[PDB]
Nucleic acid binder design. Sequence first.
RNA 1: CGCAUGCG
RNA 2: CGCAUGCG
Lengths: 123, 123, 123, 123
Amino acid sequence: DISAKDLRNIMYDHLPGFGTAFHQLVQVICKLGKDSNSLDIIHAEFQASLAEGDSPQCALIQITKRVPIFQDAAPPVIHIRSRGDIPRACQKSLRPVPPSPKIDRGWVCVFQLQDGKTLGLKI
Amino acid sequence: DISAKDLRNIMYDHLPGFGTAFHQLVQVICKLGKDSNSLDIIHAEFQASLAEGDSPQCALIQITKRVPIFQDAAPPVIHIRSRGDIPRACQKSLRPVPPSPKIDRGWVCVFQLQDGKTLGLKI
Amino acid sequence: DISAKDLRNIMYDHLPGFGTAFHQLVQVICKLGKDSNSLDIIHAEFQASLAEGDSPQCALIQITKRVPIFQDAAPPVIHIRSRGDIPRACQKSLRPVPPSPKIDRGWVCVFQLQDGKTLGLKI
Amino acid sequence: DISAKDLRNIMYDHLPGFGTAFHQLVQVICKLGKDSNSLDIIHAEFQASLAEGDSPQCALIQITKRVPIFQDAAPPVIHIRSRGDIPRACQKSLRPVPPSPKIDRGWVCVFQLQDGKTLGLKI
RNA sequence: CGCAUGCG
RNA sequence: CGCAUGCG
Ligand SMILES: [Cl-]
Ligand SMILES: [Cl-]
Ligand SMILES: [Cl-]
Ligand SMILES: [Cl-]
Ligand SMILES: [Mg+2]
Ligand code: NA
Ligand code: NA
Ligand code: NA
Ligand code: NA
Ligand code: NA
Ligand code: NA
Ligand code: NA
Ligand code: NA
């Protein structure tokens, strides 16, 4: 068994840079994983992908496609006070949110400002 | 149900320029699509990607990543007489081939000259 | 011996466009070069890079990599009133600041608004 | 102590992709290193850089600026049959050689084709 | 500004 | 085509 915090840190230590869309995806993956008791399945898939020589980024995409909790799942809403609260290497990946975004199509999360404005983070 | 020619024309209508590396990708997509009877699935993915705000170029890339026939597929080899047979706008995207290229990693096709020399087309 | 104004004019005469990130880099280079009495050394590096085939943009970058005053240097903070004060052609190169930015890693300057919000200019 | 083969492989293992300008720089560094008996210092410098959190690419550039054999050193000439013999991710880094290329200014090597054409590899 | 790698 | 990272 692995905790959410421990798994996030393992995943973060494989990712280039900081505050990228993949860093946000790690947080999303680990929260949904925790809530669905999928953390060990997720961890196993991550390790196996690395073992096969896949990039960490590739491994995270594959998790959203292969682990059941993410299949046909909507991105979580993340409430923020301002655009400045969005991770610092994600700003160019924001788009208006479509009617039915799916995590397995690259919609990581939906940021929601205090006036209710939303911005979708897309890989 | 959609013709390969018709789907090609739809795709081309969305693309900037003429004879670009993405026009070459359209042709590869339509050939492999026709052969696998996947043209309707391909047309659906193209439209779904455009609908969620993807550029036409990105929508084509999404097809290679999401439609089963392109999964792990090696690029076709296209035999040519000279480098002049390659559309001029594709020339900036030409590069030597790797050991085991995959369409879903950006390798559209491999051009091969009479003397066996090759030039890969990478988006 | 060369003045900061003369060097800036030489550099500008090489650059395309108006109000680009590279124009701001010139201003940063000439200021820190004036302060450190490095203008002749900067000038020599600029000319030496051009002579070996670097673009003017690349030659300005080579100065930040090669001239001692720019080594690990933190970028200057420029106080502004609105994001509209930042030249239009620079807008594409703006992003949030990292923990400890350095000129020789591409951080030209940091624009700061009255309320303390910041925008880093990254080449 | 370390051998030239063991050092190359250590360095290669840290580099992204294959056949890049940095892969060629590894071969150059270990060749001139071996010939000048600088392998242990080169290894020491590479490890310290990585320990500081520098990228392997950064570490290799620092070697060319810090290790005496590379200071003001001419790039080696590599005799090849045709452009196809150049490493597969170096083609876009080739340019005409200036009068006096230096490794510490990023001139990794000069390829000499059988037809007489010279092409310098520039980082 | 450009190259390389990763990802879509 | 775009984004991210690294390098010049
Ligand atoms: Cl906003
Ligand atoms: Cl449709
Ligand atoms: Cl403003
Ligand atoms: Cl290693
Ligand atoms: Mg983050
Ligand atoms: Na990181
Ligand atoms: Na067109
Ligand atoms: Na091959
Ligand atoms: Na590698
Ligand atoms: Na280059
Ligand atoms: Na990278
Ligand atoms: Na790329
Ligand atoms: Na970059």
